[PDB]
Amino acid sequence: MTEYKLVVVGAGGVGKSALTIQLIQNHFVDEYDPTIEDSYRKQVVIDGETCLLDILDTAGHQYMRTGEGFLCVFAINNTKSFEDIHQYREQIKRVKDSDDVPMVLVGNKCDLAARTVESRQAQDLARSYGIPYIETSAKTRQGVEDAFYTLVREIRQH
Amino acid sequence: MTEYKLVVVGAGGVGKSALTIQLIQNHFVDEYDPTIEDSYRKQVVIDGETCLLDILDTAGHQYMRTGEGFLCVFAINNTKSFEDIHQYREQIKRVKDSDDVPMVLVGNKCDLAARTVESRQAQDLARSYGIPYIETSAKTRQGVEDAFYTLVREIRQH
Amino acid sequence: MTEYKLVVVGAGGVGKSALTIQLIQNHFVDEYDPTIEDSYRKQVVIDGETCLLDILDTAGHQYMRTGEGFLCVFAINNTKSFEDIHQYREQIKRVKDSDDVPMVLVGNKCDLAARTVESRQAQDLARSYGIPYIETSAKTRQGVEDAFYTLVREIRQH
Numbered sequence: 181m182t183e184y185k186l187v188v189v190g191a192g193g194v195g196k197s198a199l200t201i202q203l204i205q206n207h208f209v210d211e212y213d214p215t216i217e218d219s220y221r222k223q224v225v226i227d228g229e230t231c232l233l234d235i236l237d238t239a240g241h242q243y244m245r246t247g248e249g250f251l252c253v254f255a256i257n258n259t260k261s262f263e264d265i266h267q268y269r270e271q272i273k274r275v276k277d278s279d280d281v282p283m284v285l286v287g288n289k290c291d292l293a294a295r296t297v298e299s300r301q302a303q304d305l306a307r308s309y310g311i312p313y314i315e316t317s318a319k320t321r322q323g324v325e326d327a328f329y330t331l332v333r334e335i336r337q338h
Numbered sequence: 339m340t341e342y343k344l345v346v347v348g349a350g351g352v353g354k355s356a357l358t359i360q361l362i363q364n365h366f367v368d369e370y371d372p373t374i375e376d377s378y379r380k381q382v383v384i385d386g387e388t389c390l391l392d393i394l395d396t397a398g399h400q401y402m403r404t405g406e407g408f409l410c411v412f413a414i415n416n417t418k419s420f421e422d423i424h425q426y427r428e429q430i431k432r433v434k435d436s437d438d439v440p441m442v443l444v445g446n447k448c449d450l451a452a453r454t455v456e457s458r459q460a461q462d463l464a465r466s467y468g469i470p471y472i473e474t475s476a477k478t479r480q481g482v483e484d485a486f487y488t489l490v491r492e493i494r495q496h
Numbered sequence: 497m498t499e500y501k502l503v504v505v506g507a508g509g510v511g512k513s514a515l516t517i518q519l520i521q522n523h524f525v526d527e528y529d530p531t532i533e534d535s536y537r538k539q540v541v542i543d544g545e546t547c548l549l550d551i552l553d554t555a556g557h558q559y560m561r562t563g564e565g566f567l568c569v570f571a572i573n574n575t576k577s578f579e580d581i582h583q584y585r586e587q588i589k590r591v592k593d594s595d596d597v598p599m600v601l602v603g604n605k606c607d608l609a610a611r612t613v614e615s616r617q618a619q620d621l622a623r624s625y626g627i628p629y630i631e632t633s634a635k636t637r638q639g640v641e642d643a644f645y646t647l648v649r650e651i652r653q654h
């Protein structure tokens with residue numbers, strides 16, 4: 181059975197844990213819990229293939245160099261977290277020693293009205309990296325499966 | 339004589355104290371003074387009614403649950419303070435145990451040129467909460483009476 | 497030989513040192529080095545005049561009141577640094593006891609895709625101060641000579 185090693189990175193509070201727990205357990209963690217298990221496993225069918233997702237949920241700035249693909253997460257109501265993405269991408273480029281790493285840019289908290297990052301800004305950043313941009317809500321589940329499954333489809337192209 | 343219990347909330351440095359002192363004393367505090375009295379009282383006539391404003395000027399994150407109406411203040415040159423509004427609104431929703439609380443969204447420092455929050459962004463956030471948006475300058479007095487008097491008119495609808 | 501006393505100011509990490517080292521030594525400092533010499537000297541020809549640039553590279557918040565002209569630097573991928581410009585300008589206004597100080601607003605890191613400050617936002621802020629806006633990249637050298645030489649041309653108008 182094929183295993184996909186996914187690593188979730190991005191600034192503190194963007195919803196890395198909430199996104200991963202929504203995917204794995206179909207539950208929204210509505211609080212900020214600073215003691216959540218980093219390692220998640222799930223058997224899923226993606227495009228007719230039974231596979232294992234091995235997910236590492238990292239802390240807002242080892243884990244990195246074992247990763248096959250990366251979710252780079254910011255929050256659409258957190259301009260600083262969007263600006264911080266380049267530093268996370270530079271870290272991934274350094275550990276993978278490549279500018280061709282399977283990666284999805286994730287704009288989380290898309291359920292919230294206080295948007296300070298336009299879809300077009302994030303599309304432009306993702307384009308500059310040669311990666312897809314997907315908006316998600318860990319709260320409503322919008323885009324959550326799409327973000328993780330798209331990352332698997334990006335790993336399959338590597 | 340009718341008393342209106344107003345509470346001013348929002349991020350550090352957005353001008354909660356400057357706004358309240360401009361309303362009450364017709365003076366602009368041009369410095370950042372970290373030891374300002376939290377409690378203000380003023381007898382005013384609003385729509386022909388002689389009334390008392392009992393204003394609590396809170397610190398950038400009791401006071402809350404006694405409040406009848408809330409000014410949720412950000413600065414139009416402070417994107418983080420605009421993003422922080424949702425956390426202040428969530429706090430008000432928690433203490434008032436209602437999503438129908440008399441509230442005005444205030445975009446302060448509208449005299450400044452370094453605008454990073456568009457009027458339309460703030461209008462959209464206020465719309466999502468079902469509340470008015472008003473821009474103010476504690477410096478020029480623009481919108482200051484309008485912000486506080488509108489909050490009184492919102493309390494009168496509750 | 498005419499000496500131009502230039503002072504580079506702005507928030508931590510915007511690239512004040514990278515800009516000054518790119519101008520003086522034609523090298524991009526790709527790391528964040530917290531122990532860089534503050535004082536730079538260079539003999540240059542600007543509009544046919546052989547002159548000395550005496551440059552003071554300040555830390556993200558003496559140096560100030562000796563300055564004849566100021567580069568006020570933010571990063572186009574750092575909204576907070578753009579918002580912080582007004583505080584640096586207010587400091588310059590205080591030490592020079594004038595609202596007519598030779599000054600250029602510099603939008604640095606223009607090579608980066610994660611733009612959160614629009615050119616038009618910065619043009620509007622610069623217009624409000626009566627100063628030019630120039631975009632730079634300490635990395636590619638885009639606009640670097642233009643920023644410093646424009647500041648010299650602003651000092652010559654004082």
Ligand SMILES: Nc1nc2c(ncn2[C@@H]2O[C@H](COP(=O)(O)OP(=O)(O)NP(=O)(O)O)[C@@H](O)[C@H]2O)c(=O)[nH]1
Binds near residue numbers: 197209317
């Ligand atoms: N409204 C909304 N809130 C969200 C969403 N995702 C996360 N949150 C909220 O944002 C806060 C932080 O979420 P969390 O998953 O702990 O963030 P994190 O990126 O893992 N933080 P850290 O890096 O410190 O571990 C929580 O209160 C959570 O409920 C979302 O999509 N919508």
Ligand SMILES: Nc1nc2c(ncn2[C@@H]2O[C@H](COP(=O)(O)OP(=O)(O)NP(=O)(O)O)[C@@H](O)[C@H]2O)c(=O)[nH]1
Binds near residue numbers: 355356370474
């Ligand atoms: N230009 C301008 N400056 C303002 C305006 N309102 C406040 N300020 C300035 O912003 C700074 C902070 O104001 P202040 O009222 O102390 O903010 P606060 O929200 O009460 N801060 P805290 O939460 O720490 O008590 C002061 O230097 C003040 O002069 C405004 O409308 N325009």
Ligand SMILES: Nc1nc2c(ncn2[C@@H]2O[C@H](COP(=O)(O)OP(=O)(O)NP(=O)(O)O)[C@@H](O)[C@H]2O)c(=O)[nH]1
Binds near residue numbers: 508511525604634
């Ligand atoms: N991509 C890019 N990076 C830049 C640019 N200018 C600076 N940097 C990077 O940004 C970081 C900070 O640069 P630095 O010059 O040290 O900033 P500073 O304004 O002097 N910081 P401080 O106020 O603490 O002294 C460095 O890693 C540097 O390589 C630029 O134009 N483009």
Ligand SMILES: [Mg+2]
Binds near residue numbers: 196197198216238239
């Ligand atoms: Mg977490």
Ligand SMILES: [Mg+2]
Binds near residue numbers: 296454612
């Ligand atoms: Mg914007």
Ligand SMILES: [Mg+2]
Binds near residue numbers: 354374395396397
């Ligand atoms: Mg105060």
Ligand SMILES: [Mg+2]
Binds near residue numbers: 512513532553555
């Ligand atoms: Mg420096």
Ligand code: NA
Binds near residue numbers: 280309
């Ligand atoms: Na890439």
Ligand code: NA
Binds near residue numbers: 438439
């Ligand atoms: Na409401």
Ligand code: NA
Binds near residue numbers: 596
């Ligand atoms: Na000026």
